[PDB]
Amino acid sequence: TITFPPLMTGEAAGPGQDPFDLACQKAELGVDAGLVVYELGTDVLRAALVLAPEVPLAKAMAMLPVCGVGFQNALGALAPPEVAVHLDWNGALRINGARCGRLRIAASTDDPDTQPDWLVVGLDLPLWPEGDGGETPDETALYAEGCADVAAPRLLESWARHCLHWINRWDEGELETIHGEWRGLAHGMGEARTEAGRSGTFLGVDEDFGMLLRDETTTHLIPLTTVLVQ
Amino acid sequence: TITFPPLMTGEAAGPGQDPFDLACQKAELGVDAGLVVYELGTDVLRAALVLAPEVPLAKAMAMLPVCGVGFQNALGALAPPEVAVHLDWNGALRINGARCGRLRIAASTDDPDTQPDWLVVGLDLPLWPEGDGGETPDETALYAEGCADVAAPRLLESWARHCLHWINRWDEGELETIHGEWRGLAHGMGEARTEAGRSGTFLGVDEDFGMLLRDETTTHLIPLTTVLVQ
Ligand SMILES: [Ca+2]
Ligand SMILES: [Ca+2]
Ligand SMILES: [Ca+2]
């Protein structure tokens, strides 16, 4: 039994359905915020949250870092303390330095100025490595990294709970604290980076979590809207 | 603009729709928890919340007292301190001792042992008295009772916020504290009462908020399930 906070609604994905796709489909059909679509296998955990923040898209993109912090907190509550989680700006997850899943984000609009009707954040997390020869960016899997005592259902519940904590704080105006939490977890800050066909040093982020990428002569601003799933 | 907490979804009632009925209709159609249907006029405020507590109906009935406490807290935050709010066991509201609206409750089942698929709590609050000659239990109206500086939209927002606070505490196991808050607001406790065709002294309530009604020779238990809208 998967128990979510009050006013979150869990829905297991059925045949032909995957969580991120289904949550987006349901969101476009008018299903409200608070839906958590999930799909658990022995080798993978997928889940997706439907949100509706009443701000322009530019600002609603903070839901990605917010749910990343949620995930880091959720795994830290369940895993051995030596397991390090870092968050890539683009939503990729790293466990003990290795690519191990990702957070995805979609919304009802791609205009930075428009308030979206909906936004969905999806988690994909490998639990055991898939060795079938399917193309993957993942370099490890959760249970390969010392987290064998972490149950997938409990991790899902915990992600939902910690995401809700940070989303509520974001709503109460605590963006600055969120920025600080996220900066401490950010992968590769201060280091070389290629992004959106540009290269430089990942200097940090602006208030809307846009990447500041400094090359030899200029600083590029890459808005976080660029990672929206099209 | 009516702003609700994150993961609450406001929906204004359209032509042919009223909040409590519509929320129940939508709930039976599968709309999840967190919907707040509302309808504001100059003379009346109506609203309804869709909930889905994962407990048997017997225990889910606590949502009525919970949302009553929510309302008392919400009005107290906005009204002059001399305005007294009391809660009837059956959901009726009293302002300065006079009947002035009510909370209603419905659910997907009437079996006390079954976990309901949904529960809806509705608020009906008169703002000015209706003098058209329509039959009403109400003896006053909010703006007749010194609350002219309370805006209906702000009261609605506040009800939603305070209900969510108490529903979250209920979920975290704080039933005992809820009982205490509710007992302090209860109308007519320790006094004569007629209920479900029985008469006696309203002694108090059991853990499931069932009324203990003591007559000359016995104590009746009236379960709160009896106030479910059929
Ligand atoms: Ca699937
Ligand atoms: Ca109507
Ligand atoms: Ca909802």
Pair of tokens at residue A127: 């639990």
Residue A114 within a domain: yes
- State in Å: Cα B14 to ligand 2 middle: 6
Q: In this structure, what are the phi and psi dihedrals at residue A77, rounded to the nearest 5 degrees?
A: -65, -20
Residue B73 within a domain: yes
**A170-to-A145, B76, B166 alpha-carbon distances in Å:** 31, 27, 21
- State in Å: Cα A111 to ligand 3 middle: 25
Pair of tokens at residue A174: 């605590």
> Both B196 and B111 in a single domain?
no
The answer to whether A44 touches A125, Cβ cutoff 8 Å, is yes
Whether residue B33 and residue A167 make contact (CB cut-off 8 A), yes or no, is: no
Q: Nearest CA of chain B to the CA of A164: how many Å? A: 9
HSE of B190 in the Cβ direction (CA atoms, 13 Å)? 4
> Both A224 and A183 in a single domain?
no
Cα separation, A115 vs A58, whole angstroms: 9
Query: Residue A201 belongs to what H/E stretch?
Result: strand A198-205
Q: In this structure, what are the phi and psi dihedrals at residue B82, rounded to the nearest 5 degrees?
A: -75, -15
> Both B195 and B124 in a single domain?
no
Way the structure was solved = X-ray
Residue A67 within a domain: yes
Q: Which residue of B has its CA nearest to A3?
A: B54
Question: The domain that contains B220 carries what CATH number?
Answer: 2.30.30.100
CA angle A166-A161-A126, nearest 5°? 100
Residue A198 within a domain: yes
> Both B55 and B110 in a single domain?
yes
> Both A155 and A223 in a single domain?
no
> Both B24 and B49 in a single domain?
yes
Instruction: Choose the mutation target among B32, B120, B161 for the interface with A, i.e. most A CBs under 10 Å.
Output: B32
Question: The domain that contains A173 carries what CATH number?
Answer: 3.30.930.10
**How many independent structural domains does chain A possess?**
2
Query: Residue B24 belongs to what H/E stretch?
Result: helix B19-28
- What is the distance between the terminal CA atoms of chain A, rounded to a whole angstrom? 33
Which residues of A contribute to the annotated binding site? Answer: 17-18, 33, 39
The answer to whether A70 touches A87, Cβ cutoff 8 Å, is no
Pair of tokens at residue A62: 């903070």
Cα separation, B212 vs B200, whole angstroms: 9
Whether residue A164 and residue B6 make contact (CB cut-off 8 A), yes or no, is: yes
**A101-to-A44, A91, A125, A163, B145 alpha-carbon distances in Å:** 9, 9, 4, 17, 59
* Nearest residue to B205 (alpha-carbon basis) of B169, B227, A222: B227
Cα separation, A122 vs A110, whole angstroms: 17
> Both B200 and B142 in a single domain?
no
3 state SS of A19: helix
- State in Å: Cα A147 to ligand 1 middle: 24
Pair of tokens at residue B74: 């919400």
Residue B1 within a domain: no
Residue B138 within a domain: yes
Alpha carbon dihedral A49, A54, A59, A62, in 10-degree steps, equals -30
Q: Nearest CA of chain B to the CA of A32: how many Å? A: 7
Pair of tokens at residue A162: 């910690």
Contact residues for A79 (Cβ-Cβ < 8 A; gap 6+): A146, A147, A149, A150
> Both B182 and B193 in a single domain?
no
The answer to whether B93 touches B84, Cβ cutoff 8 Å, is no
* Residue list, CB under 5 A from ion ligand 2: B 13, 18
Pair of tokens at residue A111: 């205009």
Strand segments (E) across B52-143: 85-87, 92-95, 98-107, 119-126
Whether residue A35 and residue B35 make contact (CB cut-off 8 A), yes or no, is: no
Please state whether A34 falls in left (phi above 0), alpha (psi between -120 and 50) or beta. Answer: left
> Both A169 and A196 in a single domain?
no
> Both A84 and A164 in a single domain?
yes
Please state whether A17 falls in left (phi above 0), alpha (psi between -120 and 50) or beta. Answer: beta
Which residues of B contribute to the annotated binding site for Ca(2+)? Answer: 17-18, 33, 39
Instruction: Choose the mutation target among A32, A50, A117, A165 for the interface with B, i.e. most B CBs under 10 Å.
Output: A32
Residues in chain B within 8 Å Cβ distance of A54: 3
- State in Å: Cα A37 to ligand 3 middle: 12
Whether residue A3 and residue B32 make contact (CB cut-off 8 A), yes or no, is: no
Cα separation, B70 vs B65, whole angstroms: 8
Range of the domain at B224: 188-230
Cα separation, A202 vs B185, whole angstroms: 58
Strand duo B35-40 + B9-12: pairing: parallel
B118-143: b or e for each residue (b if 16 or more CB lie within 10 Å)?
bbbbbbbbbbebeeeeeeeebebbbb
Q: Which residues of B touch A (CB under 8 A)?
A: 3, 5-9, 31-35, 51-54, 164, 167-168, 171
A143-167: b or e for each residue (b if 16 or more CB lie within 10 Å)?
bbbebeebebeebbbbbbbbbbbbb
The answer to whether A155 touches A115, Cβ cutoff 8 Å, is no
Which of A6, A34, A167 lies at the smallest CB-CB distance from B171?
A6
- State in Å: Cα A135 to ligand 3 middle: 36
Residue A180 within a domain: yes
Residues in chain B within 8 Å Cβ distance of A31: 31-32
The answer to whether A213 touches A202, Cβ cutoff 8 Å, is yes
Which residues of A contribute to the annotated binding site for Ca(2+)? Answer: 17-18, 33, 39
Pair of tokens at residue B167: 């529903």
Cα separation, B75 vs B97, whole angstroms: 15
Resolution stated for this PDB structure, in Å? 1.7
Contact residues for B143 (Cβ-Cβ < 8 A; gap 6+): B127, B128, B150
Q: Which residue of A has its CA nearest to B11?
A: A32
Contact residues for B209 (Cβ-Cβ < 8 A; gap 6+): B61, B62, B64, B65, B89, B179, B182, B224
> Both B164 and B202 in a single domain?
no
Distance of CA A69 to the CA centre of its chain: 8
The answer to whether B103 touches B88, Cβ cutoff 8 Å, is no
The answer to whether A87 touches A73, Cβ cutoff 8 Å, is no
Strand segments (E) across B91-169: 92-95, 98-107, 119-126
> Both A120 and A224 in a single domain?
no
Residue A91 within a domain: yes
Residues in chain B within 8 Å Cβ distance of A7: 7-8, 33-34, 51, 164, 167
Pair of tokens at residue B223: 């379960």
